């Protein structure tokens, strides 16, 4: 009976709410109140990456925390050398519409994805010398909102088909489809150990999946708006998810509940990207206000008004070494901050 | 700098030069986006103008290249990828004039036209109103009245007046009328001049955008 199963689901929701509340003895603000605040953070524009004829949609770093891949609607996927501003590559896409770009940790591969419903994957280190597609994954009935390489062969694709997919690139099929997101998944974040990845979908709920086993482990529904970008804590037992409601809500895995919300009366433009630091003390976010307002993770206050971009900061990222912060925007420029 | 740095900087400037020539070609290569509902004459209009995911169609006409983009596939919320169509410099909406009574598909057609034209991203992209299946509407207008489609209708069951009323309602869905202008071309689904209409309308849009960029308009 649908009625009894629905009642059981409601009872399980009541049980999870009761358990979460019963485990909520004190908040993180209580613990962090008796410590010295971060204060004010001042980072300037150290260089601007010019050359994209169209607005940059996705940005990713590499393991060496030097190279930078940027995706634009001009049909070009351009890789940059951050320290010495230089366009490494200009990949002419088969479909000019790209929303996600992922630089593999090995640095040998890049990904795009968009309205073509296909994860175009390029072996940059082509024996020819140019850049050509190595595989065109065609199993997703929707746009590819976010992809993230696990290995050179495994890619997790957050798609518009309300499901994430783990792909075998050489095989071409989906080795595992992650179902459970009632809304199309916009962003996914990987744990450092690459064992459990979260997926922030449009259902105002990020889900913690087990890559190998194949099902979701915990669910977190605190947002009033869809999750556009999610980032694990450096430790990995928590994460911050950004929404279009201009509020970032930090969730702790072990308590599987909300921890803190980073919102203010001045900030109404929705968060387009979420970034932590190498220590997690600072919560960066890019909004539609063409600005990068950055928050203190421990204490709810805005510890920076970083702004150097004329248009919306669509893609925001922090290097693996934590030295710098990249802010890709729709003004066709990527700018680093220090 | 170093010889590698010098050579890489040169390759950067010359990749920039290649992108500059690509943008030169895209100065005459105009991006069109087709917006049609389920079976709204979109196939007929793409066929006439020729003479899932997305469908890309590249061509040219009197030294004016066109890249038409069909987005019928990828059914989603459309609020998370529509911003990819910021760079499109032409929009062609598609429908059928007789689609005012079956289930109402005119309601959904006007609905996504409103979501497109009155979009917080598409406040500066202009409209071409390609209509199809005009012969069925012409035959059927005298048969059944349009008052079921619009309760505020007092006109006669004539194809001219019904078409004019539907076009007034369709145009009223736009509120920012300064940056964009709606062209109209009533097609009886057999015309071969649709590509010529696209040429003239796109040239008009190029002229208007250039005037605005010159600060004159």
């Amino acid at each position: 009976e649908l009625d009894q199963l629905r009642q059981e689901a409601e009872q399980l929701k009541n049980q999870i709410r009761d358990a979460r509340k019963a485990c909520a003895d004190a908040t993180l603000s209580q613990i962090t109140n008796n410590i010295d605040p971060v204060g004010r953070i001042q980072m300037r524009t150290r260089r601007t990456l010019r050359g994209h004829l169209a607005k940059i949609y996705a940005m990713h770093w590499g393991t060496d925390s030097r190279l930078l891949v940027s995706a634009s609607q001009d049909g070009k996927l351009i890789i940059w050398d951050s320290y010495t501003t230089n366009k490494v590559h200009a990949i002419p896409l088969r479909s000019s519409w790209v929303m996600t770009c992922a630089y593999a940790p090995s640095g040998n591969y890049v990904a795009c994805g968009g309205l073509d419903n296909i994860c175009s994957i390029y072996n940059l280190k082509t024996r020819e010398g140019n850049v050509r597609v190595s595989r065109e994954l065609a199993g997703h009935t929707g746009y590819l909102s976010c992809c993230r390489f696990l290995d050179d062969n495994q890619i997790v694709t957050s798609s518009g088909d309300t499901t994430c997919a783990l792909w075998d690139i050489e095989t071409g099929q989906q080795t595992t489809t992650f179902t459970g997101h009632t809304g199309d998944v916009m962003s996914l974040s990987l744990a450092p150990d690459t064992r459990l990845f979260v997926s922030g979908a449009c259902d105002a709920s990020a889900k913690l999946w087990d890559v190998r086993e194949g099902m979701c482990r915990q669910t977190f529904t605190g947002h009033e708006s869809d999750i556009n970008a999610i980032c694990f804590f450096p430790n990995g037992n928590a994460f911050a998810t950004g929404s279009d409601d201009a509020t970032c809500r930090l969730f702790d895995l072990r308590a599987d509940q909300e921890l803190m919300t980073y919102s203010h009366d001045n900030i109404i433009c929705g968060i387009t990207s979420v970034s932590f630091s190498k220590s997690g003390r600072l919560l960066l976010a890019g909004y539609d206000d063409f600005n990068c307002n950055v928050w203190d993770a421990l204490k709810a206050d805005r510890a920076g008004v970083l702004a150097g971009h004329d248009n919306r900061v669509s893609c925001l990222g922090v290097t693996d070494d934590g030295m710098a912060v990249a802010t890709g925007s729709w003004d066709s420029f990527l700018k680093i901050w220090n | 700098l170093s010889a590698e740095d010098k050579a890489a900087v040169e390759r950067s400037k010359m990749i920039d030069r290649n992108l500059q020539e690509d943008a030169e070609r895209d100065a005459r290569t105009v991006k069109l986006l087709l917006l049609g509902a389920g079976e709204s004459g979109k196939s007929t209009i793409v066929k006439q103008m020729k003479i899932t995911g997305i469908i890309e169609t590249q061509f040219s006409f009197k030294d004016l290249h066109f890249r038409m983009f069909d987005v019928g596939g990828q059914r989603s919320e459309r609020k998370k990828w529509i911003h990819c169509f910021e760079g499109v410099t032409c929009i062609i909406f598609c429908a059928a004039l007789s689609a005012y009574d079956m289930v109402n598909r005119m309601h959904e057609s006007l609905h996504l036209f409103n979501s497109i034209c009155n979009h917080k991203y598409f406040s500066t992209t202009s409209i071409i109103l390609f209509l199809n299946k005009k012969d069925i509407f012409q035959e059927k207008v005298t048969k059944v009245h349009l008052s079921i489609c619009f309760p505020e209708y007092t006109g006669p069951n004539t194809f001219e007046d019904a078409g004019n009323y539907i076009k007034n309602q369709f145009l009223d869905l736009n509120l920012k009328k300064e940056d964009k202008e709606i062209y109209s071309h009533m097609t009886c689904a057999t015309d071969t001049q649709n590509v010529k209409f696209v040429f003239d309308a796109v040239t008009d849009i190029i002229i208007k955008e250039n005037l605005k960029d010159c600060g004159l308009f």
Partner: single-chain antibody, 232 residues
């Protein structure tokens, strides 16, 4: 990917022999190119450089203004229009597959070559190893000191390593003195202290036989070492 060429043959000194190198397999117009000579019984020295479409052309002191090298990007062919040949110009020219970005692998592919024969303040680098008997299954660290420190503000040490097998063309082994080129076995690695530059190779096989050239990329009048031959 191929780098076939033209030209060659007995050309009188003082004349004008044009070498055309056409490539089928990769993007000629978006990937730079070079010209490195090699005498029949001598080493290899860089002759001229052409950007991916002749942006800036650089010459050696012995070919400065004397040559005129260009290319046809639509024709996928690289043209070496060379004038006023001499006795020291007879050398086997490689239209080098050279690309230039960060972590790039320039000089990755060298073409089959076309030997051209004629009728009768640089960063000098040292390859004092000369001849070394390499035994299979043994780790080899081979050195090439630089006259000028190869470090830079960006910190990249511009030293290269190339493998010249008998009858074949050089292929890049180690680029930027530390990184490993694609298609090279992982038994090669690169490390250096700024001047003394050690190329670490472990458990060598017959595929490594040949000579090893250390190339810098600081000041564009590039230098190559004499080339230490590695034979069992």
């Amino acid at each position: 990917v191929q780098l076939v060429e033209s030209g060659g043959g007995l050309v009188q000194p003082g004349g004008s022999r044009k070498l055309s190198c056409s490539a089928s397999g990769f993007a000629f117009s978006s990937f730079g190119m070079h010209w490195v000579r090699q005498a029949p019984e001598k080493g290899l020295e860089w002759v001229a450089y052409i950007s991916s479409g002749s942006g800036t052309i650089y010459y050696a002191d012995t070919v400065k203004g004397r040559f005129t090298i260009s290319r046809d990007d639509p024709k996928n062919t690289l043209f070496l229009q060379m004038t006023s040949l001499r006795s020291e110009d007879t050398a086997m020219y490689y239209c080098v597959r050279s690309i230039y970005y960060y972590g790039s692998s320039p000089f990755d592919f060298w073409g089959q070559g076309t030997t051209l024969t004629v009728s009768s303040s640089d960063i000098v680098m040292t390859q004092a190893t000369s001849s070394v008997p390499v035994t299979p299954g043994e780790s080899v660290s081979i050195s090439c000191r630089s006259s000028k420190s190869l470090l830079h503000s960006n910190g990249n040490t511009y030293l290269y390593w190339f493998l010249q097998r008998p009858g074949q063309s050089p292929q890049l082994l180690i680029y930027r003195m530390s990184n490993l080129a694609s298609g090279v076995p992982d038994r090669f690695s690169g490390s250096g202290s700024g001047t003394a530059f050690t190329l670490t190779i472990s458990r060598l096989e017959a595929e490594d036989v040949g000579v090893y050239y250390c190339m810098q990329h600081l000041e564009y009048p590039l230098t190559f070492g004499a080339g230490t031959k590695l034979e069992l």
